[PDB]
Amino acid sequence: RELRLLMLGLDNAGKTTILKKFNGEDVDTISPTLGFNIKTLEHRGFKLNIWDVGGQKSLRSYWRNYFESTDGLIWVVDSADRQRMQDCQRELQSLLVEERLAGATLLIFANKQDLPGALSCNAIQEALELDSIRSHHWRIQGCSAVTGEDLLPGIDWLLDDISSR
Amino acid sequence: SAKDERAREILRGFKLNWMNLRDAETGKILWQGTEDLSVPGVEHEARVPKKILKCKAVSRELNFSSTEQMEKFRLEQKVYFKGQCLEEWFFEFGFVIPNSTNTWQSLIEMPASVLTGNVIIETKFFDDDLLVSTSRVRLFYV
Ligand SMILES: Nc1nc2c(ncn2[C@@H]2O[C@H](COP(=O)(O)OP(=O)(O)O)[C@@H](O)[C@H]2O)c(=O)[nH]1
Numbered sequence: 001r002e003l004r005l006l007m008l009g010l011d012n013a014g015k016t017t018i019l020k021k022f023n024g025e026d027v028d029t030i031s032p033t034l035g036f037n038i039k040t041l042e043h044r045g046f047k048l049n050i051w052d053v054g055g056q057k058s059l060r061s062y063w064r065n066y067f068e069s070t071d072g073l074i075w076v077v078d079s080a081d082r083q084r085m086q087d088c089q090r091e092l093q094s095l096l097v098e099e100r101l102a103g104a105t106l107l108i109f110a111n112k113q114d115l116p117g118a119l120s121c122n123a124i125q126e127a128l129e130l131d132s133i134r135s136h137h138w139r140i141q142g143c144s145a146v147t148g149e150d151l152l153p154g155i156d157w158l159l160d161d162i163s164s165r
Numbered sequence: 166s167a168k169d170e171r172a173r174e175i176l177r178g179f180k181l182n183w184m185n186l187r188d189a190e191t192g193k194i195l196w197q198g199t200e201d202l203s204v205p206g207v208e209h210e211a212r213v214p215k216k217i218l219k220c221k222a223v224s225r226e227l228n229f230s231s232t233e234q235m236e237k238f239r240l241e242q243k244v245y246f247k248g249q250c251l252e253e254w255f256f257e258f259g260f261v262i263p264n265s266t267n268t269w270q271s272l273i274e275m276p277a278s279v280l281t282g283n284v285i286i287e288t289k290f291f292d293d294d295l296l297v298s299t300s301r302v303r304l305f306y307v
């Protein structure tokens with residue numbers, strides 16, 4: 001069957017760039033998403049429906065309207081935005097206790113690793129309290145959406161974990 | 166009735182901003198139509214490089230706006246050659262945010278003189294069973 005991947009995260013985390021970069025499309029004319037961006041494609045034999053939903057404050061209240069039937073959750077973090085790292089943590093943990101997202105595999109993309117002040121994966125692992133997560137399989141993957149570095153390693157793991165369920 | 170009045174608000178607030186065709190392999194846009202794709206008195210058409218007929222992978226993207234919130238939104242896209250079906254896509258969006266702009270894209274896997282001018286891409290958008298908008302684009306290769 002097709003797999004539904006929901007990609008969320010605070011605004012500016014780089015969700016849209018990751019999606020376009022992943023599909024070999026130009027990522028220089030990317031603007032804020034004021035709704036959703038959905039890509040239906042095939043990767044490694046899997047048919048995927050990837051939902052990149054806008055993360056502006058005003059849009060997060062609608063995130064829950066897209067939880068139903070989500071197989072995988074992709075949480076994108078701006079590794080260099082230490083400021084909103086606390087809000088990022090709260091939003092994520094809020095998602096992890098949602099009933100309509102139970103069992104969904106969690107992929108954390110610590111994005112913008114190409115930036116100078118980018119926190120390490122261990123730092124983000126701690127700042128987001130991932131070790132306490134136990135209702136979901138999860139993996140943190142550092143990456144750069146602009147260069148495209150390490151995007152596949154993250155996605156590929158996510159698909160392998162979901163399929164094993 | 167209130168129901169009819171609400172559906173008129175839905176239709177009036179919907180707009181298909183643009184649609185494009187990309188060579189999936191390279192991610193390069195082969196053709197993108199913008200300006201009033203759902204405006205009356207106009208047979209919308211598209212002049213796309215015929216080489217697209219050689220692509221094993223084509224992606225088609227749509228960008229639409231909705232002033233009104235919708236609960237069971239979906240699209241039906243069929244590509245015809247006269248009466249025969251070349252392609253048919255369906256997609257359930259479900260919830261659509263008020264005053265939102267959204268994008269949808271699918272990775273799609275005869276000569277050219279016979280096709281050109283005879284190929285139509287018909288996109289229909291529904292909110293459950295309310296027809297929100299219909300779009301027809303006749304294709305011309307090169
Ligand atoms: N240096 C660097 N910039 C990025 C990266 N990912 C996204 N950006 C930039 O961050 C801004 C927001 O990205 P965007 O994908 O639209 O964010 P979204 O709000 O989460 O959809 C844009 O200016 C992007 O070019 C990255 O990995 N590295």
Ligand SMILES: [Mg+2]
Nearest residue numbers: 015016032033
């Ligand atoms: Mg975006």
